[PDB]
């Protein structure tokens, strides 16, 4: 029988081959909301060819491509099946993957859920923490996708804009963290200190009332709480690019102060994704853990395997699905006010868009 | 009977009276684990003489002085009642207030301890979340003054740096938070914004691994889950000062920019802090509640009522103390790892003088 649910599952994306690369960058240059060029239109492919080179080489570094669609469906399938026997009364669950600047793109995803005639649709960010440039992002095109295609829809919305503490979430994170910290010497496992690693936010977006530092924040709490802060933390943060001032303390700084000041046994835990992706098999893996920490002379440099395909994990997704349907929320509280700063216009339109969905 | 445990109730301080504002000055600005300038020794005096009076009219703006010695001395009353009856084992307990920049000084406090002849010490610091700018600072003034005072300590020594989290803390705040909530007017409780706010810190000890931010967050959080996130909320930073970045959204933007978005019905709550003192009755109350507030036209703005007196706090105190005593604790593990990016020596001394107490 046809599907009744639909779990739209937000992510950026990533490249899956060499190839997709330029369509990727061009996709992210081109978007106003992340970014305001002069001539944009022109610039941005320009910008897009000029980078493809740098940004192919880190993904053959990596294997060439990114694993992100992989582990989606997986956790997806997974969580489906799940949900299927926990939530009978809203008939087959079927899950779709839409991506902000790969295939499949939030369009194409948003097309196909109405095409299949479902009763309900739930925005389902797979970002746990609630950024304005990613999840935020996310539900600007499904509010914008409608705008421009000049119908409303068909279906009925809601949207699971943030997990930050989810119970599952936070023993996953717990659970993978432990199991790591078996794989250093035993006569250093006291000594592993851990650096919880989140991708960063220029100061500029953080400044405006971005709030995701302050949930990531919350999601490493849970997490040493769960472990009974068996071993000292701090929360830093990867992926700065350019001349601008980001939220620091920087991963790749981090690593080589921790060193350099005697502490060489370290644990980096990605605590603001679910799923390996360029951040995890190249940057901290490759650039920081085989280069960086080689250079500075660590002991023991891990990196806490990333959720992927635990099915405790896809326990997690369809728990947070679940209670969003018997709880019969459009969204957080937290979606209902925009960033004291906030100088988009469509943020609120996209808030409305969720907050006054019928039913 | 005289005392057995004497319990250090670590803050910064606040000048007491208008008199007292210049030496409160002078002896922040020599401070070297909160600044390092060039000819200190002689750049101090001068800068303390040219604040003071700016200072001293915002301390008159508020009645004449600070309030934190009267509230720390009562909260200090109350935890010692709880504690003799909690710990009959501790003997009589005794608290002792350790201010950084005004009297009764840490180093007074310290020399006061050892003369009762105390059998145990510990240095509670009255900040929840830990920044090395304030608890850190409290404690390098202890290990600074044994050092200096060529002497060991004549009794055990232990600290409890940290308490983000604290049970009974969440539980003030949303308490103070639910009887501030009920004073909007009811057609607009829903409507109203919670911004949390806390002192800012420039963005070079964010930078450096300052663990403070992550553990504001943290409070944060847990404060607004006992609330079942009734309302929305934004975690902001306010009393920046000086031409550098600072860690934002400042306190007083975001007020601003929440009202020209049209969100009216504003609730402030410190929380960083658990008493009255220039953040709340000047900062707060006069410069942002008062002149920006009508500004930009609210409608209603309230702050949640600091801790103060309230006995539950008291408990919390006497709990917190009872625990570290129970668990036998010297500090937490944080405290077991400095700044990735530290670059003051003291820290890891200090951090040493209390993990290789005996005991
Ligand atoms: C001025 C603008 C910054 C706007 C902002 O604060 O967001 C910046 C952002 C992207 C920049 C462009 C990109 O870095 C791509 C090009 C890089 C070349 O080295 C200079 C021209 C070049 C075409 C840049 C011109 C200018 O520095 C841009 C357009
Ligand atoms: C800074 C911004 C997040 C905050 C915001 O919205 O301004 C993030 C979101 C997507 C990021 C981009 C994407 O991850 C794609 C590229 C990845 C490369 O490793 C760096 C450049 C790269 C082009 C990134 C620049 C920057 O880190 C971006 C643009
Ligand atoms: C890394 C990439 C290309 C640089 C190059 O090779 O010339 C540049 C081009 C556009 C840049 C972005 C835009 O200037 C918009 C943002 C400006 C903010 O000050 C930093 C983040 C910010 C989101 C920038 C991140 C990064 O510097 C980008 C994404
Ligand atoms: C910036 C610093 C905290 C981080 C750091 O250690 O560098 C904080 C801690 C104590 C603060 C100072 C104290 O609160 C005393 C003064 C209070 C006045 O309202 C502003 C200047 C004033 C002189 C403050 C400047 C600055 O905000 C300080 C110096
Ligand atoms: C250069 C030094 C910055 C130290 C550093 O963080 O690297 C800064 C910090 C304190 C500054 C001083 C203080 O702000 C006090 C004075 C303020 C006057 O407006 C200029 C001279 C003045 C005497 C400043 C000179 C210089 O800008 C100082 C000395
Ligand atoms: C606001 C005050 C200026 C006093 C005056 O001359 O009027 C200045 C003088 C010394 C400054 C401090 C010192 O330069 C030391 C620190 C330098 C960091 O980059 C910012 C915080 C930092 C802690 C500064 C805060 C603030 O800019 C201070 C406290
Ligand atoms: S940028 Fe955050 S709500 Fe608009
Ligand atoms: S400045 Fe933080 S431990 Fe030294
Ligand atoms: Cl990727
Ligand atoms: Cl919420
Ligand atoms: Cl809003
Ligand atoms: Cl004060
Ligand atoms: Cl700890
Ligand atoms: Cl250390």
Redesign the pocket.
């Known amino acids: 029988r046809k599907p009744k649910t639909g779990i739209l599952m937000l992510n950026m994306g990533g490249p899956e081959t060499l190839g997709d690369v330029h369509d990727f960058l061009l996709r992210?240059?081109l978007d106003r909301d992340?970014?305001?060029?002069p001539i944009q239109n022109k610039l941005a492919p320009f910008?897009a060819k000029?980078?493809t080179p740098?940004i192919q080489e880190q993904y053959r570094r990596i294997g060439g491509g990114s694993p992100i669609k992989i582990w989606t469906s997986k956790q997806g399938e997974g969580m489906v099946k799940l949900l299927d026997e926990l939530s009978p009364n809203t008939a087959p669950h079927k899950y779709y993957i839409g991506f902000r600047y790969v295939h499949p793109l939030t369009e194409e995803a948003i097309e196909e859920m109405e095409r299949d005639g479902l009763e309900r649709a739930i925005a389902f960010t797979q970002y746990p923490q609630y950024s304005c440039?990613t999840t935020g992002s996310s539900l600007n095109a499904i509010y914008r996708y409608y705008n421009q295609v000049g119908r409303k829809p068909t279906m009925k919305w809601s949207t699971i804009d943030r997990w930050p503490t989810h119970h599952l979430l936070i023993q996953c994170f717990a659970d993978h963290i432990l199991k790591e910290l078996d794989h250093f010497p035993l006569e250093k496992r006291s000594e592993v200190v851990i650096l919880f690693s989140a991708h960063s936010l220029?100061m500029?977006?953080v400044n405006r009332g971005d709030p995701y530092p302050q949930e990531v924040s919350a999601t490493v709490q849970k997490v040493m709480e769960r472990l009974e802060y068996c071993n000292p933390y701090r929360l830093v943060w990867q992926s700065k690019?350019?001349?601008?001032p980001?939220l620091g303390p920087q991963t790749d700084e981090s690593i080589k102060g921790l060193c350099e000041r005697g502490r060489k046994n370290i644990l980096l835990v990605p605590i603001a994704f679910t799923s390996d992706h360029i951040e995890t098999l190249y940057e901290l893996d490759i650039e920081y853990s085989q280069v960086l920490a080689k250079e500075c002379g660590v002991e023991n440099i891990r990196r806490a395997e990333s959720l992927n395909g635990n099915p405790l994990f896809s326990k997690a997704l369809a728990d947070l699905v679940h209670s969003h349907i018997q709880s019969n929320e459009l969204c957080s509280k937290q979606l209902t006010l925009s960033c004291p700063l906030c100088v988009n216009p469509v943020c609120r339109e996209t808030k409305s868009f969720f907050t006054s969905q019928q039913l």
Chains 1, 2 share one sequence.
């Open positions: 992210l240059f992340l970014m305001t060029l910008i000029r980078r740098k440039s220029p500029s977006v690019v350019g001349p601008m980001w």
